[PDB]
From Swiss-Prot, chain B:
Subunit structure: Component of the gamma-tubulin ring complex (gTuRC) consisting of TUBGCP2, TUBGCP3, TUBGCP4, TUBGCP5 and TUBGCP6 and gamma-tubulin TUBG1 or TUBG2. TUBGCP2, TUBGCP3, TUBGCP4, TUBGCP5 and TUBGCP6 assemble in a 5:5:2:1:1 stoichiometry; each is associated with a gamma-tubulin, thereby arranging 14 gamma-tubulins in a helical manner. Gamma-tubulin at the first position is blocked by TUBGCP3 at the last position, allowing 13 protafilaments to grow into a microtubule.
Gene for this chain: TUBGCP5
Cellular compartments annotated: Cytoplasm, Cytoskeleton, Microtubule organizing center, Centrosome
Span covered, complete protein: 705 to 1016 of 1024
Protein family: Belongs to the TUBGCP family.
Tissue localization of expression: Widely expressed, with highest levels in heart and skeletal muscle and moderate levels in brain.
Protein name per the record: Gamma-tubulin complex component 5
Chain's role: Component of the gamma-tubulin ring complex (gTuRC) which mediates microtubule nucleation. The gTuRC regulates the minus-end nucleation of alpha-beta tubulin heterodimers that grow into microtubule protafilaments, a critical step in centrosome duplication and spindle formation.
Organism from which the protein derives: Homo sapiens
Swiss-Prot record, chain C:
Annotated family: Belongs to the tubulin family.
Self-association and partners: Component of the gamma-tubulin ring complex (gTuRC) consisting of TUBGCP2, TUBGCP3, TUBGCP4, TUBGCP5 and TUBGCP6 and gamma-tubulin TUBG1 or TUBG2. TUBGCP2, TUBGCP3, TUBGCP4, TUBGCP5 and TUBGCP6 assemble in a 5:5:2:1:1 stoichiometry; each is associated with a gamma-tubulin, thereby arranging 14 gamma-tubulins in a helical manner. Gamma-tubulin at the first position is blocked by TUBGCP3 at the last position, allowing 13 protafilaments to grow into a microtubule.
Protein's name according to its UniProt entry: Tubulin gamma-1 chain
Gene (UniProt): TUBG1
InterPro entries in the cross-refs: Gamma_tubulin, Tub_FtsZ_C, Tubulin, Tubulin/FtsZ-like_C, Tubulin/FtsZ_2-layer-sand-dom, Tubulin/FtsZ_GTPase_sf, Tubulin_C, Tubulin_CS
Phosphoserine: residues bearing it: S102
Molecular function terms, GO-annotated: GTP binding; identical protein binding; microtubule nucleator activity; structural constituent of cytoskeleton
Taxonomic lineage of the native organism: Eukaryota, Metazoa, Chordata, Craniata, Vertebrata
Keyword Cytoplasm in record: yes
Superkingdom of origin: Eukaryota
Record: disease: Cortical dysplasia, complex, with other brain malformations 4: A disorder of aberrant neuronal migration and disturbed axonal guidance. Clinical features include early-onset seizures, microcephaly, spastic tetraplegia, and various malformations of cortical development, such as agyria, posterior or frontal pachygyria, thick cortex, and subcortical band heterotopia and thin corpus callosum in some patients.
PTM section of the record: Phosphorylation at Ser-102 by BRSK1 regulates centrosome duplication, possibly by mediating relocation of gamma-tubulin and its associated proteins from the cytoplasm to the centrosome.
Binding of GTP, residues: A113, G114, T115, G116, S117, G118
Species name: Homo sapiens (Human)
A cellular component term, taken from the record's GO annotations: ciliary basal body
Length: 369, 218, 368
């Protein structure tokens, strides 16, 4: 069960290469895509070694790197181009699907703010649901005329992508306080760390979590509540790492309660005291939950790359993420009253109203019906 | 030889020290949660009017020392101790209008003096001597006797065995003044009771057997 | 249940740092905030290790110390500057208050002799505003100066939940038993006074496992919330307390006490303490209020093994009224000697009330 990855837009093509140079480094893979001598299951991302990537000016910058053998700005303008290269790119996609044994999902890296992303990323999600109906489409989208590109795209991600947001505002903030940078070339270093540890349990043989479905299904209960958040603490026991997760000082975000938590530990900690850590957490009551439905806090273990100490990544499903939408849609209404049909942008505002409504109604004891 | 291999290696002595420690810090946070019930709610609190039976698990090598009828006595003194911590903390957590404060010092003193007597003068005097005695254990039997001569005496100094309805009830009924006055936050009708029961307390305890005079000053 | 510290002005930052020096010296914590190998519950005064310190020119001096790993002159001037950074500092408090699991108290080290007295006046009114269930104890230090002093009193008379430290009496001990004549030396005693004061909280015992457990035994009424301390050792339990009641040792420059609390940190035996109280009563070296039956309390503790019988005394003595009346007289002195100038009269009225209560507190008819 392999996952074909697609990368669109400048931001998407940039984070992917930094995600690729990170992944092949964790394994014994030379930049020439050849194994070096120097158990780790490597089939999920690599084909027999070539990564199952489809990259879509910046391409020249990638081929000039020593990793060469590894393989306008308006929403309307980006879409029009899509329909014109409709047939051209799908043969690239289709041939990769038939080549794989049992294709499972579609990882996509794109930015709503990015024009190409706001035009070409939006078009694929409708076509991907049309051609292949039984394939999950999960995207590592990243939030930043600017509000327009954002809200118009959110209209597609709420009905097409069945499943992670990365806000540049919080990322640029974290860069100043604990990294002291002031560029794009520095903040991307931490972005790659998130995507890498996000797919840790899949690349190493474990007991459960052997597919993308094995991670998402516990998080998303309903087709509407399909937005997640990440948190990376190390920038030592099992109880030490969790107390740093729940602090909003490290989560890249700018009543309210979670839905379900997934914890990923990449260290060699003694797995006996993890049940002791959870007990004290329930005693302290550090995070609020939903009363309506049964939910639990989960944790998983794995092994750090030996060829390269405890790290940690958390997957959070919080209703506070709705506020970020409101801020955007608020600015959208601000530009609507100041400036062929101008109707598609009207229905898009209405459908996102349901999403923010669903979350604000989710934090009530009567979210059902 | 037996006592030698019993300091470690089924360390009976180490287990005994912990016993009189997990009651009689840690147990401060435990009771404070009970001030503000359920039988499972307490367990997670512990693992973090007169009931709360407490027990423990003892391995066979020390089962013969800490018998079953020994748990109840250790439980007996724990129950009474909490009621003292209760009244002491209830009158402490807060901070003819000011006339109530004169009823506070006239009372917050008395319960405080009693608490200073049970813990320090008794629950720490015999405790300091008991440890100095067990470290010279030279027998299977006498270790029971030096131990059994520690409960049956601490249950006598702390007046709980006999003369209950003659003396102990007096401290018990005046403890109800620590409950009634705590909730209200009639005033003249309290000192008429308080000055009576307190004088009833001294005019009854005046019969002093001799160690009672350490508190008879007030 | 933890207590957070706040150091204000040059004085408060000086006295707190040295107190944090000795406290880290007593505990098995190296200067670099790293545990040393070489029994003590330290979660109240340490976070896992970084102290819960809120410091407020001297900042450079603190950083220059090898302990860098451990983290005008008008009263109205301080009051204005405090409102300017209202949310600036309270975010640091809130990130730590809500960052603390269960906060218990608020200790304050400040000198009312310039800007710390004004800023300290700002914190009290502000802390009572937001946190209504949090204890506020102030380790204020006493000696154009009469003005700044008397105002802080007005604020301290109704805001703080609970210790006087006058420099003059401390200046006396500086020469008598030390032979110095220095600022860097008098504080050496102040840190000893502070550290030994909370020994029962850092080393758990049977009694007094919370700061509210210690103070409320002394304070009879929220108006009379002023205390003075004693530290003679610079030997049985009777030798200590008798050395404590001598006025040569009290850090204060008819009358009677209210209640006495004693701290014993040596290896003394609990067999002889109850008899020592008797000889104190029979020989009657002190008198109490004639109205309320007053008691003397004493607690046993354990000295830091990482560091001899020592002891500390906390007192509520009505003779503290004289200290107020001096600055009070000094205020009436400069008032007729030299935009509203009306608040200064409001402060003079309330501090007159407290003094007039002291003089009546020591009478057989304190009722009414």
């Amino acid at each position: 069960r392999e996952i074909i990855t697609l990368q669109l837009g400048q931001c998407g093509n940039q984070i992917g290469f930094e995600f690729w140079k990170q992944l092949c480094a964790e394994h014994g893979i030379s930049p020439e895509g050849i194994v070096e001598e120097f158990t780790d299951r490597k089939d999920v991302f690599f084909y027999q070694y070539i990564p199952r990537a489809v990259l879509l000016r910046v391409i020249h910058s990638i081929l000039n790197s020593p990793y060469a053998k590894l393989y306008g700005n308006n929403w309307a303008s980006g879409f029009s181009q899509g329909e014109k290269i409709h047939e051209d790119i799908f043969d690239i996609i289709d041939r990769e699907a038939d080549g794989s044994d049992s294709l499972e999902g579609f990882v996509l890296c794109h930015s709503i703010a990015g024009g190409t992303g706001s035009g070409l990323g939006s078009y694929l999600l409708e076509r991907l649901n049309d051609r292949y109906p039984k394939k999950l489409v999960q995207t590592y989208s990243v939030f930043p005329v600017q509000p327009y590109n954002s809200l118009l795209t959110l209209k597609r991600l709420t009905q097409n992508a069945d499943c992670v947001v990365l806000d540049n505002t919080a990322l640029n903030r974290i860069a100043t306080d604990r990294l002291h940078i002031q560029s794009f070339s520095q903040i991307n270093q931490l972005v790659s760390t998130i995507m890498s540890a996000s797919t840790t349990t899949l690349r190493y043989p474990g007991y459960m979590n052997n597919d993308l479905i094995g991670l998402i299904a516990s998080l998303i209960p309903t087709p509407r509540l399909h937005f997640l958040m990440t948190g990376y603490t190390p920038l030592t026991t099992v109880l030490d790492v969790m107390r740093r997760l729940l602090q909003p000082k490290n989560v890249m975000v700018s009543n309210h309660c979670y839905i379900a938590i997934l914890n990923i530990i990449q260290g060699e900690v003694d797995p006996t005291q993890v049940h002791k850590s959870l007990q004290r957490i329930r005693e302290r009551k550090l995070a609020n939950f939903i009363p309506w439905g049964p939910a639990s806090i989960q944790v998983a273990l794995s092994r750090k790359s030996p060829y390269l100490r405890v790290s940690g990544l958390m997957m959070a499903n919080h209703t506070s993420i709705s506020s970020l939408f409101e801020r955007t849609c608020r600015q959208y209404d601000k530009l609507r009253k100041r400036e062929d049909n101008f109707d598609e942008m009207d229905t898009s505002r209405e459908i996102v109203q349901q999403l923010i409504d669903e979350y604000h109604a989710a934090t009530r004891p009567d979210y059902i019906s | 030889n037996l006592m030698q291999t019993l300091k470690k290696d089924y360390r009976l002595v180490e287990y005994l020290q912990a016993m009189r420690n997990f009651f009689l810090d840690t147990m401060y946070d435990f009771y404070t949660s009970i001030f503000d019930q359920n039988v499972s709610f307490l367990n997670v609190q512990l693992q973090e009017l007169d009931g709360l039976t407490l027990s423990y698990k003892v391995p066979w090598p020390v089962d013969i020392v800490i018998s079953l009828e020994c748990q109840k006595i250790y439980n007996q003194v724990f129950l009474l101790l909490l009621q003292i911590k209760w009244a002491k903390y209830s009158l402490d957590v807060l901070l003819q209008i000011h006339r109530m404060f004169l009823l506070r010092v006239k009372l917050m003193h008395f319960v405080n003096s009693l608490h200073n007597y049970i813990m320090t003068r008794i629950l720490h005097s015999t405790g300091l001597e008991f440890q100095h005695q067990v470290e010279e254990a030279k027998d299977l039997d006498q270790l029971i006797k030096i131990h059994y001569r520690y409960l049956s005496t601490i249950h006598d100094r702390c007046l709980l065995r006999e003369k209950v309805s003659f003396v102990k009830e007096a401290i018990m009924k005046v403890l109800n003044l620590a409950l009634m006055f705590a909730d209200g936050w009639s005033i003249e009708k309290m000192e008429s009771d308080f000055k009576n029961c307190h004088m009833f307390l001294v005019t009854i305890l005046n019969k002093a057997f001799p160690h009672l005079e350490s508190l008879a000053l007030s």
